[PDB]
Amino acid sequence: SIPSSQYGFVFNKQSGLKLRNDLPVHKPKAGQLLLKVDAVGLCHSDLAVIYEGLDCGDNYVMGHEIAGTVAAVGDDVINYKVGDRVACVGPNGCGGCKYCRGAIDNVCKNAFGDWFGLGYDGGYQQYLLVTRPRNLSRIPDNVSADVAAASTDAVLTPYHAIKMAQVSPTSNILLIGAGGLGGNAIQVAKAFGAKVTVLDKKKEARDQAKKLGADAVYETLPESISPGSFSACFDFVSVQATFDVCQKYVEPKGVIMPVGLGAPNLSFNLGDLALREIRILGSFWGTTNDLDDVLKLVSEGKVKPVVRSAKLKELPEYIEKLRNNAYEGRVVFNP
Amino acid sequence: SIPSSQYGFVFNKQSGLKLRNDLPVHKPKAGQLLLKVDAVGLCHSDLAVIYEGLDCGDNYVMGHEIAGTVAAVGDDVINYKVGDRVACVGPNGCGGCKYCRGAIDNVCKNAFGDWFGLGYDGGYQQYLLVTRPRNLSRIPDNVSADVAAASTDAVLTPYHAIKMAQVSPTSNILLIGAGGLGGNAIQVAKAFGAKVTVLDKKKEARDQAKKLGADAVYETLPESISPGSFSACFDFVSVQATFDVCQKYVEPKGVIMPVGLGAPNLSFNLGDLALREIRILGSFWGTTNDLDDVLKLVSEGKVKPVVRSAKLKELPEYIEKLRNNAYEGRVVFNP
Amino acid sequence: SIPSSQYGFVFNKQSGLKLRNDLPVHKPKAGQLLLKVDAVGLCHSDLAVIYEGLDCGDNYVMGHEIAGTVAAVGDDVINYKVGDRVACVGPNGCGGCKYCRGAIDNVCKNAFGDWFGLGYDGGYQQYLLVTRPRNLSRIPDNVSADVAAASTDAVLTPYHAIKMAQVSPTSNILLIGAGGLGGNAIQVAKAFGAKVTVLDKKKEARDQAKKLGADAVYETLPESISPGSFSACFDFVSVQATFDVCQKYVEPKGVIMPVGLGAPNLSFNLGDLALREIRILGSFWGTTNDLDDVLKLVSEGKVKPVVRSAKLKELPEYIEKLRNNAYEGRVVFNP
Amino acid sequence: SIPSSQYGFVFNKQSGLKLRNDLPVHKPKAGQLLLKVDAVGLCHSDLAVIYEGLDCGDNYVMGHEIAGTVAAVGDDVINYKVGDRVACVGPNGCGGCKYCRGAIDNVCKNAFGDWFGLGYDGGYQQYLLVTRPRNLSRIPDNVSADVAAASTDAVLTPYHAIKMAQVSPTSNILLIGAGGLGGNAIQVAKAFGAKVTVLDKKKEARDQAKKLGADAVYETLPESISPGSFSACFDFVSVQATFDVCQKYVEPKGVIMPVGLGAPNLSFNLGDLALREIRILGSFWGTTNDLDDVLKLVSEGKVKPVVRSAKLKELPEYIEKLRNNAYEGRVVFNP
Ligand SMILES: O=C(CO)c1ccccc1
Numbered sequence A, B, C, D: 001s002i003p004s005s006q007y008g009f010v011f012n013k014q015s016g017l018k019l020r021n022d023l024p025v026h027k028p029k030a031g032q033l034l035l036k037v038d039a040v041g042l043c044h045s046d047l048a049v050i051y052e053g054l055d056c057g058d059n060y061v062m063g064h065e066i067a068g069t070v071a072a073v074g075d076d077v078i079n080y081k082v083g084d085r086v087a088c089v090g091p092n093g094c095g096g097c098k099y100c101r102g103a104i105d106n107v108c109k110n111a112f113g114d115w116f117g118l119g120y121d122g123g124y125q126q127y128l129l130v131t132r133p134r135n136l137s138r139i140p141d142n143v144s145a146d147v148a149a150a151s152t153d154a155v156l157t158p159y160h161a162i163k164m165a166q167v168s169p170t171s172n173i174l175l176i177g178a179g180g181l182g183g184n185a186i187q188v189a190k191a192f193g194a195k196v197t198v199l200d201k202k203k204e205a206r207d208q209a210k211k212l213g214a215d216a217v218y219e220t221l222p223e224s225i226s227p228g229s230f231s232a233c234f235d236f237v238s239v240q241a242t243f244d245v246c247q248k249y250v251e252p253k254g255v256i257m258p259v260g261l262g263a264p265n266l267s268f269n270l271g272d273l274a275l276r277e278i279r280i281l282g283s284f285w286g287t288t289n290d291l292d293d294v295l296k297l298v299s300e301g302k303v304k305p306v307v308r309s310a311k312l313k314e315l316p317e318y319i320e321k322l323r324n325n326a327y328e329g330r331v332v333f334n335p
């Protein structure tokens, strides 16, 4: 019993994010599929689109952290049957260019501004039209639709980055910033078997880290901790200051991964980077395969993300709370 | 002016390959695309389907070595416009599973028996329906539709294998069997800058190799050639005998690549393979991206494949010729 | 107080392994180093040298699973000072050829028949002359000299192979044979975060596996377990039968690692290996760096090997016990 | 007939580089080896040590671009016999730490300030004491001692960087600065089969490039050349300006390699680097194995470096010439 009208929050550069009860319910052209949204997360990114003026285009339902159930499938759709529970791979790669075909759909030039809920329609509605089903990840049975939604960015982003760094059980990494996403980072790192050293200014952030399995936690790296000794450094703050710490403490041939949004530019010392073959790798969100891995890990209990439910219509208020960083535990919404 | 009826050679397990003047001309559902076939090759593979009983299913136009021009595109098709010249990526990966999304669409479990002209409809017709456009490679302007067609298997297969082996300019490889596809192998190997040593029983095969740029050519590997000294061995014959030569002459941590069809099983010496960390890697055809690379190489003139044209309807005779190995220079057909 | 005479067990092809109280105590030429043996293990390998006729040369103290303390260092030795506790990297790579310089000293052509206690002098003496100190791994303080000794083969071999397979937390591996070394394999695999499925005929072997953290344990792989679904297969039995199981159950582009000694030759099905890009990688023992990682893991308690001590002179009896497989829990000996 | 006194140019922070006729001729402690210097190059690096104040320590013969012949070998030296012609691997890695054992001896923490002729004694003498023979590369018979010496930095550095970038025949790279070392870079890149686009301000540099095999050469990159289209960018100038060009023109997931010395710091745009997964890899000189590859390539004639001979004693003047960049064609010296 699929309706033909539905409610949802659209975003318009003129009117901001406004609720609407007159939203269509597209039927699946063949190859496409209709997803009944079960849980959709909210993170800081969403706020940059609304307040901070991040241009992703105009007139789209929002929310990229999407989990839902297959409601209707166009003909020709054979990998998904109605009922199948799935998660949305944010970047919504095009699935046909050299980057997607090459295992990096997260950087697809063609899909720019066609990301779920950041160009294309998101999950802040009730029934989402999935133009390209390749960008879906089957949700393991033992995983709630809320937990999955939480993982689409909060866990996927860090997993992608740590995988990029090729962290192993012999790894000795440094994490700067255990608050933002950086919480799940710790669990993900540990799941790889690494020795994780966390660095944070805030006392809660540090306590959390301890409880989460961090091997060492510091306000400031001690003098006993020797320079150029970490195999990989993940800067979640990413400010000239923090990056400098990374380049100081990363070992030869190591990896510095600026995965924060704290400065528009960062500088590195050419002589040091060169002489010690330091590698600075940029990573962004995750691939469709990554999300597959992320759910296998959440399902396996190696990562447990922290989320609290809410009737979708309650969104507006949670956004004002988060706008003033009045909440810092992922919030998923049930439409 | 796209007709609605067309001619082509269908394959039926009951009647073999038979010409038909009553073939439909499917119009592109959105997302699909119609390809006017310009050149379609024929290779031994095709013969195993017809005589040797290789099961790929029933009732499909055949020929997987396909080159043609975009004639009509469904709506939603934005990466290809009418006119665009393209080549068919044989395996026709599904473009939505863990293997396709992960850069190995050539092993897509979902596309089994849906390969162009080996499960799904091939290029032995006039107008092919391309269900998934991801499996197309833009043909460089300076490349004839015949040369492209030649490359879809003859060159693509070896290129994929050699890339898999990570051959470099410092490589020292051994090639066994310069007749079958093995001809293009030599050029491809040289294009990577490797030192190629060819081994063949037939004298023509050897002469060809010389002319093609082989660094050394032998009937039998000389005693002066030291054991365990080749970085990679490509057995194009793949017979217990030839494989034994590879394992004898490949160096520690080297690669033995059984890329022939000469025996259903091959055995290796466990003690030697383990003690010298020998790697046996299986490869098959190529990926969509590989074909992209293959055309950049053919266009760049680093690989010139050998092909002779023919009106498509002339197919039946060429198949009887090849059936008794009466021809050994790729034959493309123009429909 | 370094003596100049010492006891130890030498191996002669004529007299077998015989105790000797007249053994020299070589003083360190510069660059060399003298190691006071603290614990030396015994494994099946040793038996093939003595009974089964494995040729490694003649007249050497035996035992390759070596742990000890630095007793005297030649001049020029700056990385090790007297006192430093170390473990012996079996292969004793040459440290100067393309393989050692290239991170694979375990396959050094130059060091053939110069392996500790399998060509060169081992640890079944009291004071071993370490010709090349590069082949030593500092033993973490919290690790007993017995545990270290245990790890030089028992753990090192499997860790090297698993790392070679690039097992990750998203991995889904299959292990065939949880008795021989295969016990530590399980822990090592788990330390990487993989999902381990074990397969063994013996009931104890299976029970052990369960207790050790195996995710699934079977006598025979169930029919519910789908073919071509494991990322990597480690055959510790390595018999045509077991290898066949691997090739049946390994997924496309997967890894089959014949790490057992059950047959001198094994055969694979060419068509399957090729069509599904299956990779057969041979591995052998471990590198110097591997042992570094192995001790960081043992020290970190991610792997706890099972060993029982014994006065070195008690060796002869333990060898007869093991000769009739009357003992199956690694035995280290203190000289 | 090995003397016991010899001439050479020592460097002292107080007196600069001064000739000396009273230099010892160390006899090889076992494991060591004595090299009769045949050719020793001179490059800008050497000038930073003498004028620009680069601290590498005190009192050492200089010149790191060393080629010579084995004159005496200590006992225990089995890989080299007297007579063997060899080249010096600059970094002189320690051959015993995690970095050297792991294939990156060029970043050895232990060998800091113990580099040939930049901490330890160089080739500006007649007979050099090679403490660690692992850091030697056999010189191919068809390669002059002068050409080898030229290659130890001039060719080795770029080869190491290009290999690090994994340039292939399908690569499309950008080179900024074809004067400094950047000349050999072009040949090296072409030896891998890449499509090389060079960018230089000076007109000679550009003309050279053309003659050297560059595919395209520009004063300023044209507007027809599309942004984010190069697989790898090598900045040999490395100035905020040039780096910016790299980040603008490198494609998604591409490589920017700041291999020049034009600025002490460089900044990158975080948003772009992250959103397009751009990788900035630092490289430095080369490994011992790299030099092995470099000589195989020079011997194979794929790279022909440009050098002019000179009696060693003529050094002082060539240094004043180069000091005012009055010469720009590598100069090797025969002692
Ligand atoms: O949604 C994300 C990544 O989590 C994002 C990050 C950078 C730019 C735009 C959006």
Ligand SMILES: O=C(CO)c1ccccc1
Pocket (backbone or CB within 6 Å): B045, B153, B157, B284, B285, C275
């Ligand atoms: O068409 C190919 C590869 O060229 C083939 C190879 C093996 C089995 C079936 C088909």
Ligand SMILES: O=C(CO)c1ccccc1
Pocket (backbone or CB within 6 Å): B275, C045, C153, C157, C284, C285
């Ligand atoms: O000691 C080992 C590996 O554990 C061995 C393995 C194969 C051949 C000779 C010796």
Ligand SMILES: O=C(CO)c1ccccc1
Pocket (backbone or CB within 6 Å): A275, D045, D153, D157, D284, D285
């Ligand atoms: O000699 C070199 C590399 O060519 C060098 C480069 C950077 C710092 C010190 C020395």
Ligand SMILES: [Zn+2]
Pocket (backbone or CB within 6 Å): A042, A043, A044, A045, A046, A064, A065, A153, A154
């Ligand atoms: Zn988000």
Ligand SMILES: [Zn+2]
Pocket (backbone or CB within 6 Å): A093, A094, A095, A096, A097, A098, A099, A100, A101, A105, A108, A109, A110, A111
């Ligand atoms: Zn794409």
Ligand SMILES: [Zn+2]
Pocket (backbone or CB within 6 Å): B042, B043, B044, B045, B046, B064, B065, B153, B154
């Ligand atoms: Zn074919």
Ligand SMILES: [Zn+2]
Pocket (backbone or CB within 6 Å): B093, B094, B095, B096, B097, B098, B099, B100, B105, B108, B109, B110, B111
């Ligand atoms: Zn697929």
Ligand SMILES: [Zn+2]
Pocket (backbone or CB within 6 Å): C042, C043, C044, C045, C046, C064, C065, C153, C154
């Ligand atoms: Zn052993």
Ligand SMILES: [Zn+2]
Pocket (backbone or CB within 6 Å): C093, C094, C095, C096, C097, C098, C099, C100, C101, C105, C108, C109, C110, C111
């Ligand atoms: Zn070696």
Ligand SMILES: [Zn+2]
Pocket (backbone or CB within 6 Å): D042, D043, D044, D045, D046, D064, D065, D153, D154
């Ligand atoms: Zn230099």
Ligand SMILES: [Zn+2]
Pocket (backbone or CB within 6 Å): D093, D094, D095, D096, D097, D098, D099, D100, D101, D105, D108, D109, D110, D111
């Ligand atoms: Zn070192």
